[PDB]
Amino acid sequence: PGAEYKAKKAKGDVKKKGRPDPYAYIPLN
Amino acid sequence: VGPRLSRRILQQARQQQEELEAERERTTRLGP
Amino acid sequence: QSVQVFGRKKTATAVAHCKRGNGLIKVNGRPLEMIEPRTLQYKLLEPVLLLGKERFAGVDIRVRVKGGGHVAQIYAIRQSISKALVAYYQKYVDEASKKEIKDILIQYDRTLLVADPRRCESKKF
Amino acid sequence: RRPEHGGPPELFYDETEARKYVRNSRMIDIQTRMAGRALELLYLPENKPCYLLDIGCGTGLSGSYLSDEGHYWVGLDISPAMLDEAVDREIEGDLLLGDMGQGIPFKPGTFDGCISISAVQWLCNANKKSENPAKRLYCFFASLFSVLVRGSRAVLQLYPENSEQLELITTQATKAGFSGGMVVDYPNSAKAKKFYLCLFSG
Amino acid sequence: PGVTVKDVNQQEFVRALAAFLKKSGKLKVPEWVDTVKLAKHKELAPYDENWFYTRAASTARHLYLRGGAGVGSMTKIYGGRQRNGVMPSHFSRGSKSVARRVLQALEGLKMVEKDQDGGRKLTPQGQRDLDRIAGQVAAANKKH
Amino acid sequence: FTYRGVDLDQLLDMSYEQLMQLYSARQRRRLNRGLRRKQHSLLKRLRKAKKEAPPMEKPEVVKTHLRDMIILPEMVGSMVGVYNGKTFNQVEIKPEMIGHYLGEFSITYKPVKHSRFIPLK
Amino acid sequence: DIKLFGKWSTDDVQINDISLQDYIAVKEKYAKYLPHSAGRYAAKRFRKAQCPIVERLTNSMMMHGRNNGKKLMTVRIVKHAFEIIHLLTGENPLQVLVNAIINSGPREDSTRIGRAGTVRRQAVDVSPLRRVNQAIWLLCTGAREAAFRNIKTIAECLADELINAAKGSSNSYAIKKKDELERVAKSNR
Amino acid sequence: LVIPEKFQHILRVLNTNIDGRRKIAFAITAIKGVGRRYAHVVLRKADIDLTKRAGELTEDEVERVITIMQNPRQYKIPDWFLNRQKDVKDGKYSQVLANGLDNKLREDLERLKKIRAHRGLRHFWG
Amino acid sequence: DKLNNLVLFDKATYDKLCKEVPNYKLITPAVVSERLKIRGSLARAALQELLSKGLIKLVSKHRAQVIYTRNT
RNA sequence: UGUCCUACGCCGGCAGGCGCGGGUAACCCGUUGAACCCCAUUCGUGAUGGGGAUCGGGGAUUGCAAUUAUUCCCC
Ligand SMILES: Nc1ncnc2c1ncn2[C@@H]1O[C@H](CSCC[C@H](N)C(=O)O)[C@@H](O)[C@H]1O
Structure with a gap:
């Protein structure tokens, strides 16, 4: 759930260059 | 009452007494 | 002959001196009706109005206040004026008059004779 | 605290709340900011005017963003005070008064998409004994799935108060035949954490 | 039996004392009286054009109460709150030259002299003047 | 050209002590506080470079680190190489830079110069 | 006679509601000169029931941050409010005030409960003390949000709030907020 | 009082509009270069009653305001x-x-x- | 909408003040300006005129609130 | 609170200068004349005499040195 966008040294959200601006997609059932 | 309040009360109560009792050049020569 | 009492609030301390006279009340050399917050004028005049102008006619009170604030001094002034009279009517008037003064003066408001034990709380590490 | 604690939507959004909603600088900013993300989130083709549903339109801020982008829409809302403010702003689309818990009164297969900006979570609480959250959510999504054309998308922005409301909305959503997911923008932030139900029919 | 300064309203007393000083015409009013703020923490100039007399009157009344006050003591009396922009406010003194030029002006009225143990006090003729004006204050207010 | 209503030619005739009032408050304080040996030696080097230079082109460049030395009116026309920490900036002293320092014509920093998910299934 | 502000008498104030006799405290023992007393009316449960009703009014107008602390200003306002209420209506401003507390009290309220998602409401009854705690709050927020941005002084917004509530009019903020609390509670038996 | 027969709603000063409803001590501040502080001493040097609105000032005293605030140094403005x-x-x-x-x-x-x-x-x- | 309250009395409303305002049962600078649509600077300046002419009784004088009343 | 706190006199409109004293301190600052608060005046719902950012020009002080504004004051 958006763990790859999590900043280790600070609480918040850090962008990445390969992937788009931070998000999280979880599918339904 | 306590130490801080009573110190101010006693000092103030003394000074009111003195202004009830209240209502020259010093003697440079000693032999008249 | 005279009586020397005190009344207090948070830090506003008063001392009152009452003796034989014609009924003048002075605070810091000023009359009771010239004390600066005129909104709380009735708090200064409560022990005079509760008891009557005739009951204060045999005594002259001079009050000195130092410390506190504008309304903390009014609460100390009205305490020491009433407390000066109940001490004067005890020592030089019969106790029947002192009991009936202390009666009607407590049922109105208990802070005219017994002080408020509320002071600022300190902070610790 | 939260506006849903106040009561029913028809009484909370009264005449005096409608005025200070219009002249609310934060509201004018973020309601159109989310409608930009929500219109972009349904992947509708460019250079093609579509017919959209503005469920819970309110003042018509999200309604005006569609019209400025060349679309047409109709709005459905429950309180007359927010609808009166929409008329005074000289909006373009049509306005409808009704409760989305009782059904969307259109023929099947009408709209190319449905847009929702902060209206959904008003169904997770029932302030009448006649009302039930489970049936009002199901009567919404079942009627939505009928009215939306096949292959279209419905994007829903909502403000859940705990994890249970996200669950209780989702199971009612997936029981009416919708498929999709939850889009969370900035999933671990605080001010920018927005929830988006993207729902589409096959 | 005579009334004193402390027995009347201090607001009414300054209005009576400044009206007395203006009618005398012997106060020395400086030239920059119409172009100065009398504190560094003010946004504007005084609203009253004759602000020098009420400042002069309030100087004499304050010297009657607690004597031995200098220029530095009277800037501390007339100080107020300085709103430092977006920063928190602080207490700032008044302007020293306005306080000084008043004390020079009262000295020319033969109302104030220096004190051997400090700043300034009131003349024996000065206290005769203020206590007389308190007579007209109480007569027109407490007797009406 | 005029500077504070004073032309260039008698400003060059003008000595230091009556240059006090033509400058601003900052430069007036600095001139009272004196000039150290570092800037006396530099002023001689600009004076020497202007001396031996051909009288129909600009003089040779003088490289210095003195970013805190105000521009006296006799410095006009000089070639000063002023250092920002990385390189030497060659500045030609026009007569409009009199009250200013030397450090603000060699900037020590560079300007700063500062795609959304759509689900498919 | 001990009179409020020197000119308002507490003798003639008649409380029509049986439920609120113990809690609207303005009668011969609670008659004070001024609504300032600095009394410890919140050191014990139901102590504030014995506080005079006008002092509770002034303590509730010391609200929204910038006015927190300033009580000499709020007793100034209630002094001017009573002198306007006597002017518009012509009877005791204390009589207008105790009619306002009675008419602005919600007699039935609703509570919010929810186990998982389903947040529903149940209608409960209102204690006689909270009928006064809600009534003073609604009149004070009624007058505060009445002006706040127009030329009307708060002394005459508070008078126009207490007069309307005593009449039972729907022009009151308090009556309009009370009725919607009653309307939700009726729907949620 | 009443509106004078020669009251001006809008005054044209220094190619800007000066509102005549505002008081003379603060209507002048509409022109740039003067503020609440400069316009008060300018009206003091002109000896103009500050209780007046900017609208009932006649053509006489509005022109000596201008020759004071454009030319301040000969009227002892420091x-x-x-x-x-x-x-x-x-x-x-x-x-x-x-x-x-x-x-x-x-x-x-x-x-x-x-x-x-x-x-x-x-x-x-x- | 926006208020365009008059800053000086015109002829119509000046008469309206001198035959109606001294019969309201309450006269205040703030209640005059809501109904006569005038600024509050003149709304109090008109009342000291009426007080000096003896058409109104004064009830309270304060820097925050001024309260006036009919004669009879 | 302190040997750096300041009193007082003179000058300037203000920041600020010159002189002369008290206090190693329940002894001087300091009856610590604090701010909200209180009483009068102007303003009158107007992005307004609310709000003060960002700027232009000048002056003063500490520093070897104030440029990328040390700090303070005026418009
Ligand atoms: N059960 C319901 N059915 C339909 N609309 C509802 C509803 N519950 C709440 N609403 C509407 O949801 C709206 C939320 S206000 C938000 C509307 C829009 N985002 C805007 O700002 O313009 C309110 O107008 C309310 O009327």
């Missing part, structure tokens, strides 16, 4: 009280109001750009 002190080009003391304020400000910008100072470059880039 040298420290003016906004335009010693100029760079012609060092003299003045008070620029309507377009002189914008022209002097523009001139102070392009002077710092032509010499390429740090302050002038950061004005250009920003």
Whole structure:
């Protein structure tokens, strides 16, 4: 759930260059 | 009452007494 | 002959001196009706109005206040004026008059004779 | 605290709340900011005017963003005070008064998409004994799935108060035949954490 | 039996004392009286054009109460709150030259002299003047 | 050209002590506080470079680190190489830079110069 | 006679509601000169029931941050409010005030409960003390949000709030907020 | 009182509109270069009653306000009280109001750009 | 909408004040300006005129609130 | 609170200068004349005499040195 966008040294959200601006997609059932 | 309040009360109560009792050049020569 | 009492609030301390006279009340050399917050004028005049102008006619009170604030001094002034009279009517008037003064003066408001034990709380590490 | 604690939507959004909603600088900013993300989130083709549903339109801020982008829409809302403010702003689309818990009164297969900006979570609480959250959510999504054309998308922005409301909305959503997911923008932030139900029919 | 300064309203007393000083015409009013703020923490100039007399009157009344006050003591009396922009406010003194030029002006009225143990006090003729004006204050207010 | 209503030619005739009032408050304080040996030696080097230079082109460049030395009116026309920490900036002293320092014509920093998910299934 | 502000008498104030006799405290023992007393009316449960009703009014107008602390200003306002209420209506401003507390009290309220998602409401009854705690709050927020941005002084917004509530009019903020609390509670038996 | 027969709703001063409803001590502040502080001493030197609105001032006293605030130094307005002190080009003391304020400000910008100072470059880039 | 309250009395409303305002049962600077649509600076300046002419009784004078009343 | 706190006199409109004293301190600052608060005046729902950012020009002080504004004051 958006763990790859999590900043280790600070609480918040850090962008990445390969992937788009931070998000999280979880599918339904 | 306590130490801080009573110190101010006693000092103030003394000074009111003195202004009830209240209502020259010093003697440079000693032999008249 | 005279009586020397005190009344207090948070830090506003008063001392009152009452003796034989014609009924003048002075605070810091000023009359009771010239004390600066005129909104709380009735708090200064409560022990005079509760008891009557005739009951204060045999005594002259001079009050000195130092410390506190504008309304903390009014609460100390009205305490020491009433407390000066109940001490004067005890020592030089019969106790029947002192009991009936202390009666009607407590049922109105208990802070005219017994002080408020509320002071600022300190902070610790 | 939260506006849903106040009561029913028809009484909370009264005449005096409608005025200070219009002249609310934060509201004018973020309601159109989310409608930009929500219109972009349904992947509708460019250079093609579509017919959209503005469920819970309110003042018509999200309604005006569609019209400025060349679309047409109709709005459905429950309180007359927010609808009166929409008329005074000289909006373009049509306005409808009704409760989305009782059904969307259109023929099947009408709209190319449905847009929702902060209206959904008003169904997770029932302030009448006649009302039930489970049936009002199901009567919404079942009627939505009928009215939306096949292959279209419905994007829903909502403000859940705990994890249970996200669950209780989702199971009612997936029981009416919708498929999709939850889009969370900035999933671990605080001010920018927005929830988006993207729902589409096959 | 005579009334004193402390027995009347201090607001009414300054209005009576400044009206007395203006009618005398012997106060020395400086030239920059119409172009100065009398504190560094003010946004504007005084609203009253004759602000020098009420400042002069309030100087004499304050010297009657607690004597031995200098220029530095009277800037501390007339100080107020300085709103430092977006920063928190602080207490700032008044302007020293306005306080000084008043004390020079009262000295020319033969109302104030220096004190051997400090700043300034009131003349024996000065206290005769203020206590007389308190007579007209109480007569027109407490007797009406 | 005029500077504070004073032309260039008698400003060059003008000595230091009556240059006090033509400058601003900052430069007036600095001139009272004196000039150290570092800037006396530099002023001689600009004076020497202007001396031996051909009288129909600009003089040779003088490289210095003195970013805190105000521009006296006799410095006009000089070639000063002023250092920002990385390189030497060659500045030609026009007569409009009199009250200013030397450090603000060699900037020590560079300007700063500062795609959304759509689900498919 | 001990009179409020020197000119308002507490003798003639008649409380029509049986439920609120113990809690609207303005009668011969609670008659004070001024609504300032600095009394410890919140050191014990139901102590504030014995506080005079006008002092509770002034303590509730010391609200929204910038006015927190300033009580000499709020007793100034209630002094001017009573002198306007006597002017518009012509009877005791204390009589207008105790009619306002009675008419602005919600007699039935609703509570919010929810186990998982389903947040529903149940209608409960209102204690006689909270009928006064809600009534003073609604009149004070009624007058505060009445002006706040127009030329009307708060002394005459508070008078126009207490007069309307005593009449039972729907022009009151308090009556309009009370009725919607009653309307939700009726729907949620 | 009542509106005078010659009351002005809008006054044309220094090619800007001065509102006649506002009081004379603060209606003058609509022109640039004067503020709440400069316009108070200007009306004091002109000996004009400050209780008057800006609308019922006649043509006599409105023209001596202008010749005071354009030319302050001969009416004992002190040298420290003016906004335009010693100029760079012609060092003299003045008070620029309507377009002189914008022209002097523009001139102070392009002077710092032509010499390429740090302050002038950061004005250009920003 | 926006208020365009008059800053000086015109002829119509000046008469309206001198035959109606001294019969309201309450006269205040703030209640005059809501109905006569005038600024509050003149709304209090008109009342000291009426007080000096003896058409109104004064009830309270304060820097925050001024309260006036009919004669009879 | 302190040997750096300041009193007082003179000058300037203000920041600020010159002189002369008290206090190693329940002894001087300091009856610590604090701010909200209180009483009068102007303003009158107007992005307004609310709000003060960002700027232009000048002056003063500490520093070897104030440029990328040390700090303070005026318009
Ligand atoms: N059960 C319901 N059915 C339909 N609309 C509802 C509803 N519950 C709440 N609403 C509407 O949801 C709206 C939320 S206000 C938000 C509307 C829009 N985002 C805007 O700002 O313009 C309110 O107008 C309310 O009327």
